[PDB]
């Protein structure tokens, strides 16, 4: 997707985010990362365990798109955004997905911490 | 030099912070310009950092460091007078008087200066001579006016 199979930001930038979205079991597998996130004091929201399906993530993408993203910049910077918009045409949005998407899109500098295990 | 009567000016304006501009304007109103001796007298007895006095006197767009004639010519060089052709009037003044802007005549009667705008743009071109303004002007008119004054 991006070109390099690596994280796009360092651990040293975890203290200046205003939103951290945690995917996976970061606490159980890499617990010092959770120590750092807890001591930083930023607002951390974990991805719900009841959303273990990719279709829920597609609903998340649809809710993010319905919140007014810039279509022209992502159209000139990506390949295949038109088909991505087409494939999310008949996707309905639930309440908890809407809340998570609002929390993510509201924050100015969010980070996503994904546990590879 | 009339320093004896220059003494009341800084004897009265003393104690006011940022009073260099006011002292310089009063000195120019007295002498017609700012002589180096008057600047030296201002720098003394009021400290005020002589270099800063000279820099202030130089900047300020208007302070004369040279003597002027009895009748001071101020030609309005604003947009409205330039539209109606004040360049021809300036050329006529330079041709008839034989002087350039910023200088003084040999007999010490006329002094040519260029100002930003006199403000009477309805009667452009305008010429100020000792507070008397001539508007809706032509080179023949200014030649006749200067001949009538002289």
């Amino acid at each position: 997707v991006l070109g390099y199979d690596a994280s796009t930001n360092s651990f040293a930038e975890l203290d200046n985010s205003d939103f951290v979205l945690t995917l996976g079991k970061v606490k159980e597998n890499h617990p010092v990362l959770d120590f750092k996130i807890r001591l930083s004091g930023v607002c951390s929201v974990a991805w719900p365990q009841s959303l273990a399906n990719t279709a829920d993530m597609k609903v998340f993408l649809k809710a993010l798109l319905n919140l007014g993203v810039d279509e022209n910049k992502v159209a000139e910077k990506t390949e295949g955004f038109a088909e991505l918009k087409a494939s999310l045409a008949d996707v309905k949005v639930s309440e908890e997905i809407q809340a998570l998407a609002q929390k993510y899109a509201k924050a100015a500098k969010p980070l996503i911490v994904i546990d590879e295990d | 030099i009339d320093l004896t009567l220059l003494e009341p000016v800084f004897k009265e304006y003393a104690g006011k912070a940022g009073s260099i501009i006011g002292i310089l304007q009063k000195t120019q109103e007295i002498y017609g310009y700012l002589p180096l001796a008057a600047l030296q007298a201002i720098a003394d007895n009021t400290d005020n950092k002589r270099a800063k006095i000279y820099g202030i006197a130089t900047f300020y767009s208007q302070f004369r460091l040279n003597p002027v004639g009895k009748y001071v010519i101020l030609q309005c060089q604003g947009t409205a007078c330039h539209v109606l052709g004040s360049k021809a009037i300036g050329s006529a003044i330079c041709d008839e008087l034989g002087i350039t802007p910023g200088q003084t005549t040999a007999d010490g009667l006329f002094t040519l200066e260029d100002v930003a705008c006199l403000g009477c743009c309805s009667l452009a071109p305008v010429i100020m001579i000792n507070g008397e303004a001539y508007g809706k002007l032509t080179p023949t008119s200014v030649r006749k006016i200067l001949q009538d004054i002289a």
Partner: protein, 118 residues
């Protein structure tokens, strides 16, 4: 390279100060010299004269630097980024060179300022 149709100010300066050499042709008008001589030294021996292109830095009343309140401290030389202000030659014939530098302390006052001997 320079175009002949534009004008650069050429000077015929005569400032034979024994210690400080001023070249207005090499001045970028950063104002560091006047700022230091006003705010730090407090002599205020130099200042700005003019406006626009005619802005030039020169001593009080366009006098020579030896006829004014200069201390000959050389702080204007030390803050200048170009060759507009230079100090005079201590050696027999000074030259542009990469000098070796040794850190010592001044041997004149009890203040004990730290120096770099080049």
């Amino acid at each position: 390279e320079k175009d002949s149709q534009v004008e650069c100010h050429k000077t015929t300066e005569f400032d034979n100060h024994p210690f400080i050499e001023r070249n207005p042709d090499k001045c970028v008008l950063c104002g560091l010299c006047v700022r230091v001589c006003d705010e730090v030294v407090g002599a205020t021996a130099i200042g700005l004269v003019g406006r626009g292109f005619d802005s030039v830095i020169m001593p009080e009343f366009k006098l020579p630097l030896s006829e004014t309140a200069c201390i000959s401290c050389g702080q204007c030389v030390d803050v200048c980024p170009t060759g507009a202000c230079m100090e005079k030659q201590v050696s027999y014939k000074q030259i542009p060179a990469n000098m070796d530098s040794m850190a010592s302390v001044c041997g004149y006052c009890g203040v004990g300022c730290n120096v770099n001997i080049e």
